[PDB]
Design a binder for this molecule. Sequence first.
Ligand code: HEM
Ligand code: HEM
Ligand SMILES: C=CCc1cccc(-c2nc(-c3ccccc3Cl)c(-c3ccccc3Cl)[nH]2)c1OC(=O)COC
Ligand SMILES: C=CCc1cccc(-c2nc(-c3ccccc3Cl)c(-c3ccccc3Cl)[nH]2)c1OC(=O)COC
Ligand SMILES: *[C@@H]1O[C@H](CO)[C@@H](O[C@@H]2O[C@H](CO)[C@@H](O)[C@H](O)[C@H]2NC(C)=O)[C@H](O)[C@H]1NC(C)=O
Ligand SMILES: *[C@@H]1O[C@H](CO)[C@@H](O[C@@H]2O[C@H](CO)[C@@H](O)[C@H](O)[C@H]2NC(C)=O)[C@H](O)[C@H]1NC(C)=O
Ligand SMILES: *[C@@H]1O[C@H](CO)[C@@H](O[C@@H]2O[C@H](CO)[C@@H](O)[C@H](O)[C@H]2NC(C)=O)[C@H](O)[C@H]1NC(C)=O
Ligand SMILES: *[C@@H]1O[C@H](CO)[C@@H](O[C@@H]2O[C@H](CO)[C@@H](O)[C@H](O)[C@H]2NC(C)=O)[C@H](O)[C@H]1NC(C)=O
Ligand SMILES: *[C@@H]1O[C@H](CO)[C@@H](O[C@@H]2O[C@H](CO)[C@@H](O)[C@H](O)[C@H]2NC(C)=O)[C@H](O)[C@H]1NC(C)=O
Ligand SMILES: *[C@@H]1O[C@H](CO)[C@@H](O[C@@H]2O[C@H](CO)[C@@H](O)[C@H](O)[C@H]2NC(C)=O)[C@H](O)[C@H]1NC(C)=O
Lengths: 553, 553
Amino acid sequence: PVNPCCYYPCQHQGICVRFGLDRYQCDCTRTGYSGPNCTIPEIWTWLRTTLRPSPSFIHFLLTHGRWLWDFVNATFIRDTLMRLVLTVRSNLIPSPPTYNIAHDYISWESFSNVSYYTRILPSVPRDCPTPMDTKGKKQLPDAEFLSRRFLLRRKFIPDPQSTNLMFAFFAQHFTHQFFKTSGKMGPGFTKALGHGVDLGHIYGDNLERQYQLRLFKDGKLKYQMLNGEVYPPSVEEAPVLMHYPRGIPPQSQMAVGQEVFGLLPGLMLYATIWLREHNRVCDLLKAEHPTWGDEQLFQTARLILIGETIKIVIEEYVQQLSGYFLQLKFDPELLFGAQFQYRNRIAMEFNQLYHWHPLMPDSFRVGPQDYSYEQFLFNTSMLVDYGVEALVDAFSRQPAGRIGGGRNIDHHILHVAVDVIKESRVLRLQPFNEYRKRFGMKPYTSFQELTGEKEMAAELEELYGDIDALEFYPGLLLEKCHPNSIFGESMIEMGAPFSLKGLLGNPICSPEYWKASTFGGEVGFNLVKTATLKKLVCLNTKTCPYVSFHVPD
Amino acid sequence: PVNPCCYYPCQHQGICVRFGLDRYQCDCTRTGYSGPNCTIPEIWTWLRTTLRPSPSFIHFLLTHGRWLWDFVNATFIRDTLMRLVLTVRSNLIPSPPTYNIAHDYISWESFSNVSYYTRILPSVPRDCPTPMDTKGKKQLPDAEFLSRRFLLRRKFIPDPQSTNLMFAFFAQHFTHQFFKTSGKMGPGFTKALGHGVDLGHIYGDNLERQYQLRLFKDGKLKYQMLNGEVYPPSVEEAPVLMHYPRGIPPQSQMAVGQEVFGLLPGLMLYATIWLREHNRVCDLLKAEHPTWGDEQLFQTARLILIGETIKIVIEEYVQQLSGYFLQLKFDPELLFGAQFQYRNRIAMEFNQLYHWHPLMPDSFRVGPQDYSYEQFLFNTSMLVDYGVEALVDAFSRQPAGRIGGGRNIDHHILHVAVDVIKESRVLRLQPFNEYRKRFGMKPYTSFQELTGEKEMAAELEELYGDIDALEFYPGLLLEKCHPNSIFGESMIEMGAPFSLKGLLGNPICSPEYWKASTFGGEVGFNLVKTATLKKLVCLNTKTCPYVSFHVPD
Ligand code: HEM
Ligand code: HEM
Ligand SMILES: C=CCc1cccc(-c2nc(-c3ccccc3Cl)c(-c3ccccc3Cl)[nH]2)c1OC(=O)COC
Ligand SMILES: C=CCc1cccc(-c2nc(-c3ccccc3Cl)c(-c3ccccc3Cl)[nH]2)c1OC(=O)COC
Ligand SMILES: *[C@@H]1O[C@H](CO)[C@@H](O[C@@H]2O[C@H](CO)[C@@H](O)[C@H](O)[C@H]2NC(C)=O)[C@H](O)[C@H]1NC(C)=O
Ligand SMILES: *[C@@H]1O[C@H](CO)[C@@H](O[C@@H]2O[C@H](CO)[C@@H](O)[C@H](O)[C@H]2NC(C)=O)[C@H](O)[C@H]1NC(C)=O
Ligand SMILES: *[C@@H]1O[C@H](CO)[C@@H](O[C@@H]2O[C@H](CO)[C@@H](O)[C@H](O)[C@H]2NC(C)=O)[C@H](O)[C@H]1NC(C)=O
Ligand SMILES: *[C@@H]1O[C@H](CO)[C@@H](O[C@@H]2O[C@H](CO)[C@@H](O)[C@H](O)[C@H]2NC(C)=O)[C@H](O)[C@H]1NC(C)=O
Ligand SMILES: *[C@@H]1O[C@H](CO)[C@@H](O[C@@H]2O[C@H](CO)[C@@H](O)[C@H](O)[C@H]2NC(C)=O)[C@H](O)[C@H]1NC(C)=O
Ligand SMILES: *[C@@H]1O[C@H](CO)[C@@H](O[C@@H]2O[C@H](CO)[C@@H](O)[C@H](O)[C@H]2NC(C)=O)[C@H](O)[C@H]1NC(C)=O
């Protein structure tokens, strides 16, 4: 007999539980609905679902009518809206987390073992006809064909929100502290056990690595001086595992918390910036805390950098990403009243969702010169030759590509997208519309509705056979984008829960941690509270270049 | 200069932060007080502290006036009070946890690294005159002398609350899943990374161990049949590390989740009981879930046993320990409204606090026979000869010793108390009265007030020199006990925060987990909801012996 839980029968977060040979029952417990399939709303849930605005309508409000929003930003209405949206966007994420790749059920091993990526929706049961559901073809479309036809960039499409490469490298840099898939244990496992904003891309993902990187004097990190400017230490001075081209002299390498940051200068640029910041923070502490030691200095400086990392992400990174006129504000006290679980677990859906390779351009413009990918990647000497200032300026001045819409991934990095479609199929993710339903949206009824256009939609229908059999990763990048937006509706509504939960779920936002003593006096607490991207870049350089997440007008 | 933070200047959970060469400042942030030392109450906090009853007065209410309490139990006043107790006894424990042995400050390493025992109060700073504070002698009293004089049992003093050995072995069994100090890494570190009710004393503390113990058929654990009764497998069948006397035949050893349970029959008795229950739970699940596998069966049976473990501890274990007329009830939904962090971290203070070796008697009476310690401990064949039923009956009928008051630890196990006083000094715990202040009690003003008697108080004053220099572990056991109670005021107010946080901090109590699907249908959910000690013992035996936490009248 067929497995009933492959029809995805239960809506609104109902849990499909098999009884007997061919039956099922669903736990609509605390789902807000009732019935065999949890399709009968309770009195309040119906009240909510009727008085709701549509997600496209709310993007309209938040991206139009500035006069109203400038008034709302300067009044308390922001804080209430901050709480409103802040307290709402996190309820879609199970906490404590539920599932992982091996377990499609709540289990103690899925909770204790932090090496698993957690999961929002259970996997497609293995005993079912189509690889996605009861629906669709019996074979999935070729991954490399899908990419070469729909995700491959043909002409550079820039981000209409002015996003620059300075932003994209931060996204790569910032998100490679919790997205570190271990090739040895296979997809679905993670090396980054911090499972959040731990700055494990700076201080490494284990004690052994940070000890080799720490200078053990005044809490600082080891470093080297090239051209009179501070740079991270060479692998010779700091003997840590690094992924570098063979035969590269081990005095031109550099040691950082993330093994991979040597492969792009933009990532090492950020690692350089954070190290200078850390050592600068350590200098301020020792000035006001003469009696402290190396561990005391280091750990407090870490928390400071963690704090001002989250600050910059909320109020400048997400602020740019959303296009919202509602001023986003980092204030942990907004969640002190609500029941909030201060702990995160990276979900494999967040990993798939966050692959923003379309941000990368056709080639990299650094002032007068134009470096190709072969001429840019792996360049061990590019950062030192140009200096932090010139590279930060060059990236901030160069546009970055749009994420959504499709056909905007450069051919050099397209082999990632194919391996991601392959990975999505091996992890056995549920189809796209099922993730829409789980994230408070109605399923798309046809590919024409998805893409909002006729040619590429009709072909997709020929490959997949049915909209309900669409995959997760292809659907996100091919969805019609919001008007003059960087990516479409689904990427907003699905990534926003994970990102919020991962930034405000950090323990420093908790009531027990978010106090001035946690940061060794008010100096640290105000460094976190008043942090900006411009400050982080210009306080650690001899000059102040143009730094922002958007190109100048 | 002297370290100012050794005067313990800041009260009411104020954090001492050193500035400069010889200054300090305190973060009274969210402490409810104000001032340099957080001694100036706010309007509400003063309102609370004046309308407070004394802890001895509330014990009077909860242990007298049965007519009132029987009425309160059958009405909603129980549930409202349950919330009250839940929201009061849990706020004193930092979550996320703050300190550990190496770090006397909030740090990212103390949060991530689960091998550390966490901590409530920072260690006594190393640069200060006396080992406890600015106060007291320059040398602490000899630990072995303190034990032989004040903690050594002279005549068996029984528990006036009727506590039996059946209770005490459960306390040892239940609490050896989170109290597993690693001898290799030294005091202050833990092998039990679950840090709570993970039943790691049944399923081992790592995947390698549980796989060797699991039978991998219908989710069951391996086992062996002796005399027609189920017993845990011999080390030969299940090859896991065990601590056993040398040369003992391996087909007479037994393999369990906790390496140490072979050294006492009472501990192995409980492990036997839990295993039979686990395999019985696995039988019920397979009956209703034919399509499930070994991993699916096993993990759900684990959660069921975890649930009914917590149920038995709250409604029967603590019920016995407290003597409260208010019937305590296990209901996670009582905390759904409050902001409750569903995560625990074992505190080294809880480890010191729960060393209840006074419960152990002079000799163990098993029906007609009376086994000495040498004749009882390490007895590889005692459990199988007498059978589970006869031992459960024998222990429930035999009284257990009182914990508090002092001079009630048997000489066989007194070397533990000595090593605990040594361990407390190595971990560098703050003096007793400082823990009273941190746990919402006024400090004792003299040793005569502590013990409520004159002889042993005067000697303690001679050894210690000052009440404010009293150690943590001695103070708990020597404190005057509540009238006709097993232990005194301090053990109540200090243990209840850790115990409550560790049982209801288990994720299964969270809203995300506490549903019927988490236990594979209503059968699992009702096994958890209706669990009792009598059921756990008699459902897994051919006969039902006398099982209880109290001797018969
Ligand atoms: C030239 C630019 C880039 C290059 C060369 C590059 C390269 C790679 C490679 C080789 C992988 C491994 C995928 C696999 O082996 O299947 C990867 C994964 C990933 N990429 Fe990129 N990438 C670039 C830009 C970006 C950007 C701008 C983002 C923005 C978010 C991003 C996000 C990610 C993430 C989150 C992963 C997951 C890593 C993991 O799961 O361990 N990448 N990238
Ligand atoms: C015959 C009865 C008992 C024996 C033989 C025994 C034996 C031991 C031993 C040898 C230690 C190690 C201490 C050290 O090495 O410094 C220990 C620790 C401990 N004992 Fe017992 N004990 C008994 C009864 C109890 C009881 C009734 C309790 C009730 C709570 C208890 C609670 C503990 C705890 C919590 C630890 C801490 C273990 C750790 O920190 O790793 N013990 N016991
Ligand atoms: C106080 C602030 C609350 C708060 C804290 C921390 C993070 C967020 C956050 N927002 C968003 C977001 C929201 C709406 C529209 C667009 C975006 Cl990109 C995202 C996100 C979504 C998808 C992919 C990636 C990301 Cl990073 N993550 C966050 O929410 C916001 O600040 C904006 O929404 C109110
Ligand atoms: C829904 C119930 C919440 C709840 C769950 C789980 C455990 C507890 C708990 N209580 C106590 C306790 C509390 C007051 C007086 C006496 C005791 Cl022995 C203890 C404890 C204290 C000291 C040493 C050891 C222990 Cl085990 N542990 C608990 O708290 C209570 O039920 C009673 O609190 C007034
Ligand atoms: C809940 O959803 C399930 C699956 O979508 C529905 O079950 C199907 O019902 C149709 C209508 O008779 C049958 O033709 C299918 O054979 C059923 N499939 C399965 C697996 O049972 C069910 O009807 C829905 N519940 C309600 C009340 O409508
Ligand atoms: C977390 O889980 C993974 C996989 O479940 C564990 O790694 C596996 O352990 C088993 C048995 O020890 C081995 O047979 C596998 O070869 C290991 N690797 C993989 C990819 O499965 C890992 O040990 C667990 N981590 C912890 C702390 O328990
Ligand atoms: C790494 O980048 C450096 C620039 O710092 C490249 O060297 C430049 O190469 C361009 C032509 O590609 C010349 O116009 C510049 O004069 C060179 N500058 C220096 C200092 O050499 C270098 O070619 C890049 N490495 C790789 C492998 O492409
Ligand atoms: C906070 O507590 C500290 C320590 O008890 C107080 O410092 C003492 O103050 C008394 C009276 O001023 C002096 O006699 C002692 O010499 C001080 N001891 C030290 C180490 O400085 C301090 O006064 C308290 N703060 C307030 C406002 O009362
Ligand atoms: C947790 O912390 C402990 C102690 O800091 C770490 O164990 C020590 O690691 C250092 C460096 O690797 C060694 O020099 C010590 O000998 C180790 N043992 C002790 C008792 O210090 C441990 O590695 C950390 N665990 C994690 C997951 O980070
Ligand atoms: C382990 O306990 C067993 C009881 O099951 C002990 O054997 C008994 O010993 C007593 C005297 O101590 C005799 O009266 C009984 O006849 C014995 N019964 C059996 C079946 O042998 C045994 O001595 C204990 N082991 C140790 C090391 O003390």
